[PDB]
Amino acid sequence: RPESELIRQSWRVVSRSPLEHGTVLFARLFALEPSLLPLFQYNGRQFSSPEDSLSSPEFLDHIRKVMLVIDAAVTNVEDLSSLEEYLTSLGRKHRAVGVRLSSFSTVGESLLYMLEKSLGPDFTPATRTAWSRLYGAWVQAMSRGW
Numbered sequence: 001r002p003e004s005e006l007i008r009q010s011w012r013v014v015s016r017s018p019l020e021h022g023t024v025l026f027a028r029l030f031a032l033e034p035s036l037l038p039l040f041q042y043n044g045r046q047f048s049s050p051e052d053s054l055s056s057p058e059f060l061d062h063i064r065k066v067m068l069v070i071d072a073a074v075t076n077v078e079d080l081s082s083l084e085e086y087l088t089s090l091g092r093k094h095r096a097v098g099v100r101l102s103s104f105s106t107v108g109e110s111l112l113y114m115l116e117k118s119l120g121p122d123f124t125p126a127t128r129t130a131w132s133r134l135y136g137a138w139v140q141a142m143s144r145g146w
């Protein structure tokens, strides 16, 4: 797993404090597409601003949830044949709550953004590329899906 090690190596850094990094991801996501903000509704209430979501334990718990899943996807980076059916299932939950396949690009770009900011110089071209491949493989899975 030559291209896998890069993923585990890069991830171990962000895996240490999942909320902080997952916070950066969604801050970024909401900064790029604020139209995704109302998809996260808790207590029958809509977040007015992106920062409102940051004060929601429900929403923070969601971030952890997402961070845990990617970290799982990182565990299985070598085969990718184990997580397949969970992803189609996860993608199934996403279609259900009314997310669009076209937002995947935005989440991926937010994920890559978060990784770049965290790693700095360590976020090598090879590392960027492997993550793009990796994220691509999840989206395809989650898209099988719709």
Ligand code: HEM
Pocket (backbone or CB within 6 Å): 036, 039, 040, 041, 062, 065, 066, 069, 070, 090, 093, 094, 097, 099, 100, 101, 102, 103, 104, 105, 107, 138, 139, 142
């Ligand atoms: C394509 C853009 C995406 C959008 C707009 C989106 C939006 C959402 C929303 C609105 C929820 C509902 C959570 C809640 O109701 O509290 C959710 C759940 C979730 N998301 Fe995302 N999502 C996207 C892609 C992804 C990707 C690529 C992953 C990880 C590979 C992911 C991981 C998760 C997980 C693990 C959950 C909760 C699963 C569950 O509750 O069963 N999402 N997403």
